[PDB]
Design a protein around this ligand. Structure first.
Ligand SMILES: [Zn+2]
Lengths: 155, 24, 98, 80, 127, 206, 60, 118
RNA sequence: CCGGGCACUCUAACGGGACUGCCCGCGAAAGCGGGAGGAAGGAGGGGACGACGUCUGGUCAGCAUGGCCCUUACGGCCUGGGCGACACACGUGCUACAAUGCCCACUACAAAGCGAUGCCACCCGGCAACGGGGAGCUAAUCGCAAAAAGGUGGGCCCAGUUCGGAUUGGGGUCUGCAACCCGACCCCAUGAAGCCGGAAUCGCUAGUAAUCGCGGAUCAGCCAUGCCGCGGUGAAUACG
């Protein structure tokens, strides 16, 4: 991005819920190219909440995920002494993706054999403020602020 | 797994025929 | 009724090299089978430029034997004469069958 | 592991001057380089002068030492 | 009574015949849900006939063959999105914003020397 | 080197191959064997007339030496004299027997290769290294040429100092894969180390 | 490569298991293409004009 | 359940539960459920009394195993020793035998990396 | 499939289409914001092409080529041996550590190439590599080939495990004068390390990375996981 600020890729509206950001999630499980399996993988961890519960995973991903979405983070920074950590108001598109870059990561970490489970079972704990991901997100929302000791370099 | 000479992808990798790798 | 194959080296040489072997017989044997295309097959060699090391630059080399067809439909000796040994082309060769 | 099939091969440099030798209690240490000839039974008594690419080496053959090829016992290069 | 709508994509021919009233697909046999095995991404070819409401009102005969199925659902897609205007060159309103009318540029690249994957360059150690 | 060879770069674009025969396969490997067995001499002994292009005709058994030669006369020979003393060497190989036919070359000062060996003979001459080159670039230049370039290399005057001396004029656009050009290369075995020279010639263009 | 080895341009080895191709001109052994019976080098500089009819600088 | 020479496929599908003998691999594994005809699936925890006996009886008699097999091999090697055949020569120094380079690699038949200096 | 018919695919061969021209805002202008319509853009995407010169970069084992030097030999000829060692260390990769996985059974879409004692449909002996006999092709119209991933059903249940296949014993097919030194391949057995890798560190901005599978050349068969290409499925992200 040294010449042009670049431009964001946009996608199709899930052949299901009718949303695309989820296309991403469904693709954040996508691994190796086989979104085929991953297609369902997500989908099922839904009808396994319509099999394991009776509330369509709409506010789950929603109200939950957006929580796993870091309201603020820390970064490096060099001057005359070193690369001092800096607290700064996170981005949207960043905060955003990190929702999933964290779901699918600490979500496949949870030991529940089949992809599906870990999936459903994660959105779960997520849509409750508990379990895997939310730590990191917080872990850092917490990291930042905890490092509020740095602001001389504001940004 | 790819060297399991005696498996599908085994003879399907090395690219050969044997007991496990049939004709049809 | 008169199969005429002719692979080649040039696209409209060959193409034309027989395109003279067409419409005459479209008023002699009855008609023709038209200037028949036919998918062309190729060869390649891409090799290491200059000996020793380097490699990575081989440079590519094609070569096409463009198989072409035009087949005159139905003889008639009028056909056999209407584009008989009534030849002309050089860059191409021909296979005669029926 | 190993394989010959229908028509095992014994070099007729030794196998040849082997059949003849035998006729008196076998010869007395053949000299044919041939270290690529299947070891054969009747020999069992001889001694082989097989090459080493520089050297010729002793090999009093046996029937047990048969399913072999003269120099599988003829160690080429040199180690420690 | 009859209309048309061809379709190519990523290398996959696929004319989308259509004699309205409904729209039962018949790709090389296997009715719609048999050729492309209910893979989430196959309910996308007819996607165009879904923002026009024709869907259950425009019968069609879909056949196709040319490389790989992931694309075919897109190849065919063209005509099933092409039909609604072929005969109805009016339907270009609830057509455009969806670009189901636009061709699919995306294609495949090709391996040049000093490479592994048409771009995937090897590696070196210390430098 | 960081260049190619426009001749190669320029084939189906403006320099149609020297050889013509088709088919190939069980064939090709020989047709281009003998083909390259006639060059051993042919356009070598007869270079003293036009060692330019050595075009070949064919159709199997239908050999030919459409060979182009500037000096249309150290050949043909009074109605057909050399055009035989050599058919008798044309068929000293060709079991197909060719229809040999010397070709009338125009201003040699437009025939790159010609110049190459030219300035080359004119380089074995020790005679005006560069000056000749300055001449060359011009001859060729004024003799119609729209561009002209010559490039001797490796040792000069026996310079124990290997070097490459430039020289061209008008305009010599290569990259313009189209405008058509022309090239040529020769040599010069020396009492100090064989070297060689190029020879380029842009022209009408298109 | 040199002329101390043209005992194959003939093809008469001694067995069906001996035929070091030898490139027409290059004459070396290491790359003797078949379709042209010469060398990978030969392929380049020659085809580089009209010494490989039917050829061309391959691109696509 | 002890089938072959001191062996015990327990709670694990008889099929492979047999490849638990220095003489059985998934090849002979089925050639058992054959001349034996036993329902291959169903764990051993369901294996009848005369069934265990048959393969027991068909396997112990049909192939040379464990003790016998093990030490039989000890011989071949023990063989290639006395006999100058290279094969022996290699088991002699504890290094590859059928056809490998030995500049590098072969860490398994040569043992754990023994570094030096140069 | 036998007619029957080019409207459709593709076939190789021509030419048409895009230029910031139209749309409207900034500006002196280039042109930049966005839109119109367009199959498409603001150089559609990918190549082929690498300036005057640079390090005396690389090769005289391609050949050539100035000269130095041995010449019953610092040519050669043949069999044999070596280039393939090995206490080790580096480079690039293959395979895998697995359950988004491995395995079996039934079914489907690749494009580009390739084949005359040369690829080889089939019937049939063998568990098998392969053998014996044989249909069409001179190759859009026969075949090498079957694509695999994947879809469907089902076997495994978190195990150094039906993961993974090193290594090793034994029998055996094959080219071939000959596979001990060193040939691939197939069958049985054996089944090793490896539960994702210290510091450090390599690739890619899209149909690319990733994953899957196909052919090619040299080539008797072959140490190819290499190389040169095709294509199937198809991301992430770039504040600055
Ligand atoms: Zn050569």
């Amino acid at each position: 991005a040294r010449r042009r600020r670049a431009e964001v890729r946009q996608l199709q509206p899930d052949l299901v819920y009718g949303d695309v950001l989820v296309t991403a999630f469904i693709n954040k499980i996508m691994r190796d190219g086989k979104k085929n399996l991953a297609a369902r993988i997500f989908y099922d961890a839904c009808k396994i909440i319509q099999e394991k519960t009776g509330q369509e995973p709409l506010k789950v991903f929603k109200q939950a995920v957006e929580n796993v979405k870091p309201r603020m983070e820390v970064r490096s920074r060099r001057v005359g002494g070193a690369n001092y950590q800096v607290p700064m108001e996170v981005s949207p598109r960043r905060q955003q993706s990190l929702a999933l870059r964290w779901l699918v990561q600490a979500a496949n970490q949870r030991p529940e054999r089949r992809a599906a489970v870990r999936i459903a079972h994660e959105l779960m704990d997520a849509a409750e403020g508990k379990g895997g991901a939310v730590k990191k997100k917080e872990d850092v929302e917490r990291m930042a602020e905890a490092n509020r000791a740095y602001a001389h370099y504001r940004w | 797994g790819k060297g399991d000479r005696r498996t599908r992808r085994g003879k399907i990798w090395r690219g050969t025929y044997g007991k496990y790798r049939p004709r049809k | 009724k008169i199969r005429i194959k002719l692979r080649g080296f040039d696209h409209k040489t060959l193409d034309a090299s027989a395109q003279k072997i067409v419409e005459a017989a479209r008023r002699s044997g009855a008609q023709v089978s038209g200037p028949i295309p036919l998918p062309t097959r190729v060869r390649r060699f891409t090799v290491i430029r200059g000996p020793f090391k380097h490699k990575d630059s081989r440079e590519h080399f094609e070569l096409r034997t463009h198989n072409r067809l035009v087949d005159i439909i139905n003889p008639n000796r009028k056909t056999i004469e209407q584009l008989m040994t009534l030849d002309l082309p050089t860059g191409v060769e021909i296979e005669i069958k029926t | 592991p190993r394989s010959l099939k229908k028509g095992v091969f014994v070099d007729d440099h030794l196998l040849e001057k082997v059949l003849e030798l035998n006729a008196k209690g076998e010869k007395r240490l053949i000299k044919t380089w041939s270290r690529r000839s299947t070891i054969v039974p009747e020999m069992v008594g001889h001694t082989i002068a097989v090459y080493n690419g520089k050297q010729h080496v002793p090999v009093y053959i046996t029937e047990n030492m048969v399913g072999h090829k003269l120099g599988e016992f003829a160690p080429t290069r040199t180690y420690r | 009574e009859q209309y048309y709508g061809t379709g190519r994509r990523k290398e996959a021919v696929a004319r989308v015949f259509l004699r309205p009233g409904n729209g039962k697909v018949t790709v090389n046999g296997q009715d719609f849900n048999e050729y492309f095995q209910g893979l989430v991404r196959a309910v996308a070819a007819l996607e165009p006939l879904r923002a026009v409401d024709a869907l259950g009102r425009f019968d069609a005969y879909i056949t196709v063959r040319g490389g790989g199925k992931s694309g075919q659902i897109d190849a065919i897609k063209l005509g099933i999105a092409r039909a609604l205007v072929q005969y109805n060159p009016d339907y270009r309103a609830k057509l455009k914003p969806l670009g189901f009318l636009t061709r699919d540029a995306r294609v495949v690249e090709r391996k040049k020397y000093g490479k592994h994957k048409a771009r995937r360059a090897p590696q070196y150690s210390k430098r | 080197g960081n260049k190619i060879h426009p001749i190669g770069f320029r084939l189906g674009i403006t320099r149609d191959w020297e050889s013509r025969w088709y088919a190939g396969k069980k064939q090709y490997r020989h047709l281009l064997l003998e083909d390259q067995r006639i060059r051993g001499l042919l356009e070598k002994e007869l270079y003293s007339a036009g060692l330019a292009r050595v075009d070949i005709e064919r159709a199997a058994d239908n050999v030919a030496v459409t060979v182009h030669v500037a000096k249309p006369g150290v050949v043909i020979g009074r109605g057909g004299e050399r055009i035989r003393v050599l058919r008798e060497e044309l068929a000293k190989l060709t079991g197909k027997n060719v229809a040999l036919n010397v070709q009338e070359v125009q201003n040699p000062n437009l025939s790159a290769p010609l110049v190459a060996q030219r300035v080359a003979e004119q380089i074995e001459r020790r005679f005006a290294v560069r000056r000749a080159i300055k001449q060359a670039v011009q001859r060729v230049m004024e003799s119609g040429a729209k561009g002209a370039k010559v490039i001797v290399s490796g040792r000069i005057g026996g310079a124990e100092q290997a070097r490459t001396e430039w020289a061209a004029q008008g305009r010599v656009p290569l990259h313009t894969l189209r405008a058509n050009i022309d090239y040529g290369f020769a040599l010069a075995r020396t009492t100090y180390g064989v070297l060689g020279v190029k020879a380029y010639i842009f022209l009408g263009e298109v | 490569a040199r002329k101390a080895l043209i005992e194959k341009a003939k093809r008469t080895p001694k067995f069906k298991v001996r035929a070091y191709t030898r490139c027409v001109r290059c004459g070396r052994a290491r790359s003797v293409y078949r379709f042209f019976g010469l060398c990978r080098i030969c392929l380049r500089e020659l085809a580089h004009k009209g010494q490989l009819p039917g050829v061309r600088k391959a691109s696509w | 359940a002890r089938i072959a020479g001191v062996e015990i496929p327990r709670n694990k599908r008889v099929d492979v539960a047999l490849t638990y003998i220095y003489g059985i691999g998934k090849a002979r594994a089925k050639e058992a459920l054959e001349k034996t005809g036993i329902n291959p699936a169903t764990r051993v925890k369901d294996l009848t009394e005369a069934e265990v006996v048959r393969l027991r009886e068909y396997v112990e008699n049909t192939w040379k195993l464990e003790g016998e097999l093990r030490a039989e091999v000890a011989a071949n090697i023990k063989r290639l020793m006395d006999i100058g055949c290279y094969r022996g020569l290699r088991h002699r120094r504890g290094l590859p035998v059928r056809g490998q380079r030995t500049r590098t690699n072969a860490r398994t038949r040569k043992g754990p990396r023994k570094t030096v200096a140069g």
